[PDB]
Enzyme design. Structure first.
Site, PDB file in Angstrom:
ATOM      1  N   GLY A  25      30.287 -20.723 -12.299  1.00 48.65           N
ATOM      2  CA  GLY A  25      31.267 -21.566 -11.637  1.00 48.65           C
ATOM      3  C   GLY A  25      31.889 -20.875 -10.441  1.00 48.65           C
ATOM      4  O   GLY A  25      32.189 -21.511  -9.431  1.00 48.65           O
ATOM      5  N   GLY A  38      30.380 -18.091  -8.866  1.00 52.18           N
ATOM      6  CA  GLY A  38      29.285 -17.764  -7.972  1.00 52.18           C
ATOM      7  C   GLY A  38      28.784 -18.963  -7.193  1.00 52.18           C
ATOM      8  O   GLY A  38      28.220 -18.814  -6.110  1.00 52.18           O
ATOM      9  N   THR A  60      23.476 -18.389 -21.037  1.00 54.28           N
ATOM     10  CA  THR A  60      24.033 -19.171 -22.134  1.00 54.28           C
ATOM     11  C   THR A  60      24.695 -20.445 -21.611  1.00 54.28           C
ATOM     12  O   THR A  60      25.348 -21.168 -22.364  1.00 54.28           O
ATOM     13  CB  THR A  60      25.063 -18.358 -22.935  1.00 54.28           C
ATOM     14  OG1 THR A  60      26.100 -17.894 -22.061  1.00 54.28           O
ATOM     15  CG2 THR A  60      24.395 -17.166 -23.605  1.00 54.28           C
ATOM     16  N   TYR A 117      20.909  -7.280 -18.371  1.00 52.19           N
ATOM     17  CA  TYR A 117      21.335  -7.455 -16.987  1.00 52.19           C
ATOM     18  C   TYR A 117      21.266  -6.132 -16.226  1.00 52.19           C
ATOM     19  O   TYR A 117      21.024  -6.114 -15.019  1.00 52.19           O
ATOM     20  CB  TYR A 117      22.757  -8.024 -16.920  1.00 52.19           C
ATOM     21  CG  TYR A 117      22.876  -9.492 -17.278  1.00 52.19           C
ATOM     22  CD1 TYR A 117      21.877 -10.401 -16.946  1.00 52.19           C
ATOM     23  CD2 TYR A 117      23.996  -9.970 -17.943  1.00 52.19           C
ATOM     24  CE1 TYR A 117      21.989 -11.740 -17.272  1.00 52.19           C
ATOM     25  CE2 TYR A 117      24.118 -11.307 -18.273  1.00 52.19           C
ATOM     26  CZ  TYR A 117      23.111 -12.186 -17.935  1.00 52.19           C
ATOM     27  OH  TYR A 117      23.227 -13.517 -18.260  1.00 52.19           O
ATOM     28  N   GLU A 140      17.830 -11.287  13.571  1.00 54.80           N
ATOM     29  CA  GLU A 140      16.387 -11.091  13.608  1.00 54.80           C
ATOM     30  C   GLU A 140      15.725 -11.561  12.313  1.00 54.80           C
ATOM     31  O   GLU A 140      14.528 -11.845  12.293  1.00 54.80           O
ATOM     32  CB  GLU A 140      16.061  -9.622  13.868  1.00 54.80           C
ATOM     33  CG  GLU A 140      14.623  -9.376  14.283  1.00 54.80           C
ATOM     34  CD  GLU A 140      14.368  -7.937  14.687  1.00 54.80           C
ATOM     35  OE1 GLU A 140      15.346  -7.208  14.950  1.00 54.80           O
ATOM     36  OE2 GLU A 140      13.187  -7.534  14.736  1.00 54.80           O
TER      37      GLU A 140
HETATM   38  N1  GTP Z   1      20.335 -11.037 -12.536  1.00 52.56           N
HETATM   39  C1  GTP Z   1      21.560 -11.155 -13.041  1.00 52.56           C
HETATM   40  N2  GTP Z   1      22.061 -12.403 -13.351  1.00 52.56           N
HETATM   41  C2  GTP Z   1      23.309 -12.530 -13.865  1.00 52.56           C
HETATM   42  C3  GTP Z   1      24.094 -11.409 -14.086  1.00 52.56           C
HETATM   43  N3  GTP Z   1      25.273 -11.821 -14.598  1.00 52.56           N
HETATM   44  C4  GTP Z   1      25.255 -13.169 -14.704  1.00 52.56           C
HETATM   45  N4  GTP Z   1      24.040 -13.621 -14.263  1.00 52.56           N
HETATM   46  C5  GTP Z   1      23.600 -15.024 -14.190  1.00 52.56           C
HETATM   47  O1  GTP Z   1      24.666 -15.829 -13.728  1.00 52.56           O
HETATM   48  C6  GTP Z   1      24.640 -17.096 -14.350  1.00 52.56           C
HETATM   49  C7  GTP Z   1      26.051 -17.485 -14.777  1.00 52.56           C
HETATM   50  O2  GTP Z   1      26.975 -17.139 -13.769  1.00 52.56           O
HETATM   51  P1  GTP Z   1      27.997 -15.904 -13.936  1.00 52.56           P
HETATM   52  O3  GTP Z   1      27.812 -14.885 -12.838  1.00 52.56           O
HETATM   53  O4  GTP Z   1      27.821 -15.268 -15.294  1.00 52.56           O
HETATM   54  O5  GTP Z   1      29.462 -16.571 -13.864  1.00 52.56           O
HETATM   55  P2  GTP Z   1      30.467 -16.271 -12.641  1.00 52.56           P
HETATM   56  O6  GTP Z   1      29.736 -16.154 -11.325  1.00 52.56           O
HETATM   57  O7  GTP Z   1      31.271 -15.026 -12.933  1.00 52.56           O
HETATM   58  O8  GTP Z   1      31.431 -17.560 -12.615  1.00 52.56           O
HETATM   59  P3  GTP Z   1      32.254 -18.000 -13.928  1.00 52.56           P
HETATM   60  O9  GTP Z   1      31.463 -19.011 -14.722  1.00 52.56           O
HETATM   61  O10 GTP Z   1      33.549 -18.615 -13.463  1.00 52.56           O
HETATM   62  O11 GTP Z   1      32.554 -16.790 -14.780  1.00 52.56           O
HETATM   63  C8  GTP Z   1      23.695 -17.000 -15.535  1.00 52.56           C
HETATM   64  O12 GTP Z   1      22.598 -17.867 -15.367  1.00 52.56           O
HETATM   65  C9  GTP Z   1      23.222 -15.563 -15.562  1.00 52.56           C
HETATM   66  O13 GTP Z   1      21.838 -15.485 -15.806  1.00 52.56           O
HETATM   67  C10 GTP Z   1      23.596 -10.151 -13.777  1.00 52.56           C
HETATM   68  O14 GTP Z   1      24.286  -9.152 -13.970  1.00 52.56           O
HETATM   69  N5  GTP Z   1      22.326 -10.029 -13.253  1.00 52.56           N
HETATM   70  C1  PN6 Z   2      26.355 -18.375 -26.493  1.00 51.78           C
HETATM   71  C2  PN6 Z   2      27.294 -18.649 -27.690  1.00 51.78           C
HETATM   72  C3  PN6 Z   2      26.491 -18.556 -29.016  1.00 51.78           C
HETATM   73  C4  PN6 Z   2      28.410 -17.574 -27.654  1.00 51.78           C
HETATM   74  C5  PN6 Z   2      27.872 -20.096 -27.511  1.00 51.78           C
HETATM   75  N1  PN6 Z   2      27.483 -20.975 -26.576  1.00 51.78           N
HETATM   76  C6  PN6 Z   2      28.200 -22.091 -26.744  1.00 51.78           C
HETATM   77  N2  PN6 Z   2      29.027 -21.908 -27.775  1.00 51.78           N
HETATM   78  C7  PN6 Z   2      28.821 -20.685 -28.244  1.00 51.78           C
HETATM   79  C8  PN6 Z   2      29.491 -20.176 -29.282  1.00 51.78           C
HETATM   80  C9  PN6 Z   2      30.762 -20.669 -29.618  1.00 51.78           C
HETATM   81  N3  PN6 Z   2      31.259 -21.793 -28.954  1.00 51.78           N
HETATM   82  C10 PN6 Z   2      32.516 -22.314 -29.258  1.00 51.78           C
HETATM   83  O1  PN6 Z   2      32.903 -23.302 -28.639  1.00 51.78           O
HETATM   84  C11 PN6 Z   2      33.313 -21.721 -30.229  1.00 51.78           C
HETATM   85  C12 PN6 Z   2      34.567 -22.283 -30.492  1.00 51.78           C
HETATM   86  C13 PN6 Z   2      35.605 -21.543 -31.045  1.00 51.78           C
HETATM   87  C14 PN6 Z   2      35.754 -20.191 -30.761  1.00 51.78           C
HETATM   88  C15 PN6 Z   2      36.804 -19.476 -31.324  1.00 51.78           C
HETATM   89  C16 PN6 Z   2      37.712 -20.117 -32.159  1.00 51.78           C
HETATM   90  C17 PN6 Z   2      37.570 -21.470 -32.439  1.00 51.78           C
HETATM   91  C18 PN6 Z   2      36.518 -22.180 -31.876  1.00 51.78           C
HETATM   92  N4  PN6 Z   2      32.828 -20.591 -30.906  1.00 51.78           N
HETATM   93  C19 PN6 Z   2      31.555 -20.066 -30.602  1.00 51.78           C
HETATM   94  O2  PN6 Z   2      31.172 -19.073 -31.221  1.00 51.78           O
END
Ligand code: GTP
Ligand code: PN6
Ligand code: ACP
Ligand code: GDP
Ligand code: CA
Ligand code: MG
Ligand code: MG
EC number: 3.6.5.-
Lengths: 334, 437, 54, 427
Positions: free
Chosen positions: B144, B146, B179, B224, B254
């Site tokens: 979000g 990025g 994820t 990563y 360039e």
């Molecule tokens: N190659 C590479 N990809 C990354 C890395 N960290 C996150 N990503 C990719 O970035 C995507 C998600 O965006 P993020 O960078 O984690 O989120 P953000 O840019 O911090 O924005 P937020 O959602 O607000 O936290 C995923 O599809 C990941 O695969 C990294 O260290 N290396």
């Molecule tokens: C990638 C992973 C497995 C972390 C994931 N992706 C989407 N959901 C989750 C997990 C959760 N997603 C949730 O929404 C979640 C809700 C929650 C967390 C803490 C306390 C109460 C509810 N708890 C989880 O573990």
């Protein structure tokens, strides 16, 4: 448990393939738009190759070679043969052809058309079949799409009794390792009406399509002569065999065409895999010399051979990739 | 000399930035404390490496970089990292809560309350420049921050820096390591908004980098850290021309000239070789011909596609190590006859070669082995459109049911912006089609 | 075949080889988009508090 | 990112106390509130659920609510009864008498403002509050009536905060009173509107698990709550322990909730264990993946084969091959991809935590957003209609100022929720 999808319902061939797969109890059919497939029996037009091999934890396979259309289109086939050094301008087994665009190598076609007239030799051609260059160009421009002008074979080998014209269809399967497999069973799609040398207007004895012919069923069932008969006829009538007089040339042409485009379509190191069934059409002349007419990327088989061919496709092209818990093909080595 | 400023947005951008600046310091012999013993011009100068580094009176070389995230977690690791003394606090900007993988939240909601702060910290670096070229932006399509905040920033940079070029280093989303399920949305949205603001963007599919680590480095489950260290090598190869003495790609302008004939089609495909495991023994050193031929293998590309079924508009070969022009031309002559390399009729079928005698530097304790010679090919082929097709298909599937849309509308975005951004992508796919076939 | 524009130095060298010849929104508008979306949020948050007030 | 916990009613406090009892052991906190662990991983994200006290003690950021002092006195006299902040014990005297009206309109209305004062005090101490979580039943009066009343008011004062809930669904198999379908229907109407994520914990499922699987002839509420506390500890793992994962409640909600009203998830856990009975064999990764997807492990009496998964989240705990997990997860999908919607690509995400729970070398928690959950709501609807068609037991509610129309509306809204799940089950 492997999974596959079907995105071409009109495929008489792969309708039998899917039927066979489901009957093994190890293959499951998914919906059209389910991306989680192991095999894709895809469509003929706009096949999304770009979305293949991107599903994690899924070996993907498709029944079509991306880029093979350059071999399966008449306008493309001519260009491919004329431009490829492996095949070259002086290709011995391909009739003299030229590409013509409706109002291009039109001026080049006329240059050769003159030598035929200023040589007093056979100057008959085909797109309709005519001997005059004027009647042909006017026909192409009246249709709309692009057409290819090809030298007509005025002296074809004629079956007897009947004085009949024919064409040979060979089904070739190229697996994921680019092994070229020739189906041992071919077919002679014959004309039931005798060949008329003078009148070209009657296109019922010049064109040997299974649809046009349907004297249907007089000599053999459905104007289709298989190899065991045509081989026997050659032995009795010409003291030769199908293997020697014709089939060596066929296997040479098949091997040559696919070797040429191999570096372009080969999925050897790709993230997805491909195989494809082809349909080579040939034309033999009176001096027993095989000519390549064209190549079909989406061929239909013959009723007798559907049971055997479709099984073969499953055995070598599909089950080779996705194994389960003498051969009908001839491997053209290279 | 003309300076360049690097911008790292989001988790992906920041951590990748760390990998790159870690590598840059090793290449230029700069230490974690910022001291560069080889720099005899203490206090300043205008060398090639001064494009990415500015100098203090104490002899410290600081990156011309600004790290930004809507969350303190990732950037905090930079504040306490091994290169903590390298940067200074004003370069590191953090928010409170992230964009939660929501473009609208990163662009409109949270982006609006921090955009002025970032542009100010950027302006602080810009004032230290005698002649600013432009910016190098690192981010992810999926995140979000990025995606959302990047697009917002890129819009403002085109306003506050109209004459400056802007290059992108984007991470194309891959389900294998993400994820997030709403990545297709964020990707289409940020591309539509940034397209007219980016001069040249280098996409990097994590899928490709993931498999390259599995296949060639023998890592079962790449992290990563593994991905970024490999990505930083590619980025280093691309930006080496800006940081070292040469004649090819010495300025950001360039890059546009040599790789981007048509503006909208500014996504050059990068291919890198050789990638050799550091744990591998008895490694036979690959030659110029063997690595150059590997630049046309899909399994070495940053994005998985088939250039054979596409047309080239440009192609650059960036060598690093023991390479001479004679061996290159001999390699090209062989490859041209054995591969399908089609160029568009309105472009010359040729290669712009750039050689740097210093072999590629590898991080000590890293996964990559030291090689005698390496190459990075930058080719603008229409075959990269396959990445857009995959992305737009996933977009259409979800949007047809308006899935997850309420999250974006809830942040002030309009549902019309989804279709508008999609229509622009549809137009983009057509542009590749016309040039392609 | 044809090597051209060969430039050399101590760090390395560069050249070009040809095998064959050929054949913005303003700051006003931006602020107008960011604030417009903010009003849509304020309206949504208002309709909520109105709904909760009921 | 801090989280404020709330627990209302008899069930909510018994489950809530059990939850704090489990995670306090995982973080190495004793009943006194002092840390006695060995790994720093136990303290890296302890701020999420614990406040740091004066003498380096750790106080749960929990608020205990009830309209009778009975249960809350049992908590304070319980094992980890002393760990809770005494000011956070907000309680009435009259009770709810298993009446939703009493909890939401009359008796609970007298006490709700007192609760919010404690909520506000906890929130003002948070550096960056990411959301709330509630534990309660829907068949009672306090946890159901007053629980939804709190949610409605928390959203009023914290409109931009995530609100999650651990809701226990009533069932005739495990029933206290006949008016449970009434209270449940009235509460669901509230949860559809004012919650981001609701974890439907069906007492029917918890009973059948104890009876059929765990082989317990006559399971008590203690048996049921053991399964809940283990599950709750699982869905909170990704926040309570660090590993290379950067997501708050909102981010998780964004990737689990494609549609606002359809946010009712099916909890699941593997291996299913009974109290005391120590298992000696650790399950393999294929065994964890197969069980957590099996209906026998679903804590919501619903057949996932009768519906389709919108989104799926699984969290494995313990030392295992993350590759083997990815293989087994991708294996289940590609084997039964028909039970996953094709219009949400890659809707099955997975994470792994190195720290396993107590008593198990490795386990897995299942969070499924399936359309099959409608079977639960349809079940409550039938029980509701059966009585409401004769207006039976309705005088208990009209005596508290409620009208028949409010029952008709709650009936209609739940039937609308059922139809919505049916819409995407055929898509
Ligand atoms: N190659 C590479 N990809 C990354 C890395 N960290 C996150 N990503 C990719 O970035 C995507 C998600 O965006 P993020 O960078 O984690 O989120 P953000 O840019 O911090 O924005 P937020 O959602 O607000 O936290 C995923 O599809 C990941 O695969 C990294 O260290 N290396
Ligand atoms: C990638 C992973 C497995 C972390 C994931 N992706 C989407 N959901 C989750 C997990 C959760 N997603 C949730 O929404 C979640 C809700 C929650 C967390 C803490 C306390 C109460 C509810 N708890 C989880 O573990
Ligand atoms: N150069 C040529 N000389 C002689 N006959 C030719 C010829 N080109 C085509 N024919 C005849 O034309 C008939 C069909 O032509 P062609 O195969 O080009 O059409 P078609 O390709 O649409 C049928 P298919 O795709 O099934 O093979 C064949 O029976 C063959 O007899
Ligand atoms: N799992 C579990 N469920 C309970 C427990 N106590 C009550 N319930 C359920 O909750 C409903 C009764 O609600 P209750 O908690 O007594 O209402 P309240 O205390 O007034 O808020 C019934 O449907 C029970 O099945 C418990 O200790 N454990
Ligand atoms: Ca200097
Ligand atoms: Mg982030
Ligand atoms: Mg009770």
């Amino acid at each position: 448990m492997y999974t596959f999808v079907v995105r071409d319902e009109n495929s008489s061939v792969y309708a039998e393939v899917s039927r066979l797969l489901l009957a093994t109890g190890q293959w499951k059919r998914l919906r059209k738009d389910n991306p989680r497939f192991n095999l894709m029996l895809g469509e003929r037009n706009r096949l999304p190759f770009g979305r293949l091999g991107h599903e994690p934890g899924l070996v993907q396979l498709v029944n079509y070679y991306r880029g093979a259309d350059k071999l399966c289109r008449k306008a493309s086939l001519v260009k491919l043969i004329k431009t490829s050094p492996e095949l070259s301008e002086s290709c011995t087994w391909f009739p003299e052809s030229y590409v013509i665009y409706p109002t291009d190598e039109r001026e080049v076609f006329l240059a050769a058309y003159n030598r035929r007239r200023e040589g007093r030799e056979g100057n008959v051609w085909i797109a309709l079949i005519s001997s005059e260059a004027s009647e042909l160009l006017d026909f192409i421009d009246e249709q709309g799409q692009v057409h290819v002008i090809q030298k007509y074979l005025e002296k074809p080998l004629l079956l007897e009794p009947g004085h009949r014209k024919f064409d040979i269809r060979s089904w070739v399967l190229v697996d994921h390792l680019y092994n070229i497999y020739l189906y041992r069973e071919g077919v002679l799609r014959t004309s039931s009406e005798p060949y008329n040398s003078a009148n070209f207007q009657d296109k019922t004895c010049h064109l040997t399509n299974h649809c046009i012919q349907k004297n249907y069923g007089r000599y053999e069932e459905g104007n289709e002569m298989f190899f065991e008969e045509f081989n026997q006829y050659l032995m009795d009538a010409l003291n030769t065999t199908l293997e020697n007089s014709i089939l060596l040339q066929i296997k040479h042409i098949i091997r040559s065409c696919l070797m040429c485009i191999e570096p372009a379509i080969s999925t050897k190191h790709l993230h997805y895999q491909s195989f494809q069934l082809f349909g080579f059409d040939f034309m033999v002349d009176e001096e027993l010399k095989v000519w390549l007419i064209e190549v079909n990327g989406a061929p239909a088989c013959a009723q007798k051979l559907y049971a055997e061919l479709c099984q073969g496709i499953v055995d070598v092209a599909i089950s080779s990739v996705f194994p389960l818990a003498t051969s009908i093909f001839i491997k053209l080595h290279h | 000399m003309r300076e360049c400023i690097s911008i790292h947005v989001g988790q992906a951008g920041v951590q990748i930035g760390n990998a790159c600046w870690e590598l840059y310091c090793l290449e230029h012999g700069i230490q974690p404390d910022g001291q560069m013993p080889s720099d005899k011009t203490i206090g300043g100068g205008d060398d090639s490496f001064n494009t990415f580094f500015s100098e203090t009176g104490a002899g410290k070389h600081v990156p011309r970089a600004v790290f930004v995230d809507l969350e303190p977690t990732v950037i905090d690791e930079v504040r306490t990292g091994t290169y903590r003394q390298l940067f200074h606090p004003e370069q590191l900007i953090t928010g409170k809560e992230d964009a939660a993988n929501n473009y609208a939240r990163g662009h409109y909601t949270i982006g609006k309350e921090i955009i002025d702060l970032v542009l100010d910290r950027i302006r602080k670096l810009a004032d230290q420049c005698t002649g600013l070229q432009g910016f190098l932006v690192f981010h992810s399509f999926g995140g979000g921050t990025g995606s959302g905040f990047t697009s917002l920033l890129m819009e403002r940079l085109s306003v506050d820096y109209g004459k400056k070029s802007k290059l992108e280093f984007s991470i194309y989303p891959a389900p294998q390591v993400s994820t997030a399920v709403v990545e297709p949305y964020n990707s289409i949205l940020t591309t539509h908004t940034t397209l007219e603001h980016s001069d040249c963007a280098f996409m990097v599919d994590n899928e490709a980098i993931y498999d390259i680590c599995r296949r060639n480095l023998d890592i079962e489950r790449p992290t990563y850290t593994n991905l970024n260290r490999l990505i930083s090598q590619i980025v280093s190869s691309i930006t080496a021309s800006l940081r070292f003495d040469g004649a090819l790609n010495v300025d950001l302008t360039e890059f546009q000239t040599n790789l981007v004939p048509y503006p909208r089609i500014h996504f050059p495909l990068a291919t890198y070789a050789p990638v050799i495991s550091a744990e591998k023994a008895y490694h036979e050193q690959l030659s110029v011909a063997e690595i150059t031929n590997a630049c046309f293998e899909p399994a070495n590309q940053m994005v998985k596609c088939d250039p054979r079924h596409g047309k080239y508009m440009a192609c650059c070969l960036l060598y690093r190590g023991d390479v001479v022009p004679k061996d290159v031309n001999a390699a090209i002559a062989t490859i041209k006859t054995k591969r399908s390399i089609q160029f568009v009729d309105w472009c010359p079928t040729g290669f712009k070669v750039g050689i740097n005698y210093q072999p590629p530097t590898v991080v000590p304790g890293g996964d990559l082995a030291k090689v005698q010679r390496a190459v990075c090919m930058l080719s603008n082929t229409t075959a990269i459109a396959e990445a857009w097709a995959r992305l737009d298909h996933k977009f259409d599937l979800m949007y047809a049911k308006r899935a997850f849309v309420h999250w974006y509308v809830g942040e002030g975005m309009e549902e019309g912006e989804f279709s508008e951004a999609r229509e622009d992508m549809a137009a983009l796919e057509k542009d590749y089609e016309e040039v392609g076939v | 075949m044809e090597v051209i524009e060969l430039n050399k130095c101590t760090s390395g060298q560069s050249f070009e080889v040809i095998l064959k010849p050929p054949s913005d929104p303003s700051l006003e508008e931006i602020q107008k988009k960011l604030e417009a979306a903010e009003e849509r949020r304020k309206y949504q948050e208002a309709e909520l508090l109105k709904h909760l007030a009921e | 990112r801090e989280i404020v916990h709330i627990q209302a009613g008899q069930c909510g406090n018994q489950i809530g106390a059990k939850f704090w009892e489990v995670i306090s052991d995982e973080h190495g906190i004793d009943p006194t509130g002092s840390y006695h662990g060995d790994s720093d991983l136990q303290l890296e994200r302890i701020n999420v659920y614990y406040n740091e006290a004066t003498g380096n003690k750790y106080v749960p950021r929990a608020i205990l609510v009830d309209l009778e002092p009975g249960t809350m006195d049992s908590v304070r006299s319980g094992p980890f009864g002393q760990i809770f902040r005494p000011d956070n014990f907000v309680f009435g005297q009259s009770g709810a008498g298993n009446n939703w009206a009493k909890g939401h309109y009359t008796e609970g209305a007298e006490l709700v403002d007192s609760v919010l004062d404690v909520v506000r005090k906890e929130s003002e101490s948070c550096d960056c509050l990411q959301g709330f979580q509630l534990t309660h039943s829907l068949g009672g009066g306090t946890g159901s009536g007053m629980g939804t009343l709190l949610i409605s008011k928390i959203r009023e004062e914290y409109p931009d905060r995530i609100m999650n809930t651990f809701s226990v669904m009533p069932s005739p198999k495990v029933s206290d009173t006949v008016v449970e379908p009434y209270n449940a229907t009235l509460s669901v109407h509230q949860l559809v509107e004012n919650t981001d994520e609701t974890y439907c914990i069906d007492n029917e499922a918890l009973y059948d698990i104890c009876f059929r699987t765990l082989k317990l002839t006559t399971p008590t509420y203690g048996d049921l709550n053991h399964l809940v506390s283990a599950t709750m500890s699982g869905v909170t793992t990704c926040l309570r322990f660090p590993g290379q994962l950067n997501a708050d409640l909102r981010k998780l909600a964004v990737n689990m909730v494609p549609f606002p009203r359809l946010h009712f998830f099916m909890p699941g856990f593997a291996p299913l264990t009974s109290r005391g009975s120590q298992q000696y064999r650790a399950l393999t990764v294929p065994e964890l993946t197969q069980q957590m997807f099996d209906s026998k492990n679903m804590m919501a009496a619903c057949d996932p084969r009768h519906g389709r998964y919108l989104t799926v989240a699984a969290i494995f705990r313990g030392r295992m091959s993350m590759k083997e997990v990815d293989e087994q997860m991708l294996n289940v999908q590609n084997k039964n991809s028909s039970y996953f919607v094709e219009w949400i690509p890659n809707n099955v995400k997975t994470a792994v935590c190195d720290i396993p729970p107590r008593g198990l070398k490795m386990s897995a928690t299942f969070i499924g957003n399936s359309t099959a959950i409608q079977e639960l709501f349809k079940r409550i609807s039938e029980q509701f209609t059966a009585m409401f068609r004769r207006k039976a037991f309705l005088h208990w509610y009209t005596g508290e100022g409620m009208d028949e129309m409010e029952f008709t509306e709650a009936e209609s809204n739940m039937n609308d929720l059922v139809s919505e799940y049916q819409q995407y089950q055929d898509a």
